[PDB]
Amino acid sequence: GSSGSSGVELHKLKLAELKQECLARGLETKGIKQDLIHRLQAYLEEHAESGPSSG
Numbered sequence: 825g826s827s828g829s830s831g832v833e834l835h836k837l838k839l840a841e842l843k844q845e846c847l848a849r850g851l852e853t854k855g856i857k858q859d860l861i862h863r864l865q866a867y868l869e870e871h872a873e874s875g876p877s878s879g
Contacts, residue, residue: 834861834864834865835861839857839860842857842860842861842864843860845860846860846862846863846864849864849867850863851863851867
């Protein structure tokens with residue numbers, strides 16, 4: 825409505841948060857912050873729910 829935030833970003837999440845997400849998903853919680861995020865994004869894009877059909 826006002827002064828709100830529409831859209832979640834992994835970056836915002838801390839190292840502990842990123843690792844937690846990977847654990848629940850069942851991915852490798854190894855590497856650094858970038859490693860966790862990169863893996864999360866790759867998985868999201870691959871296991872995309874809605875079609876990319878943009879426009």
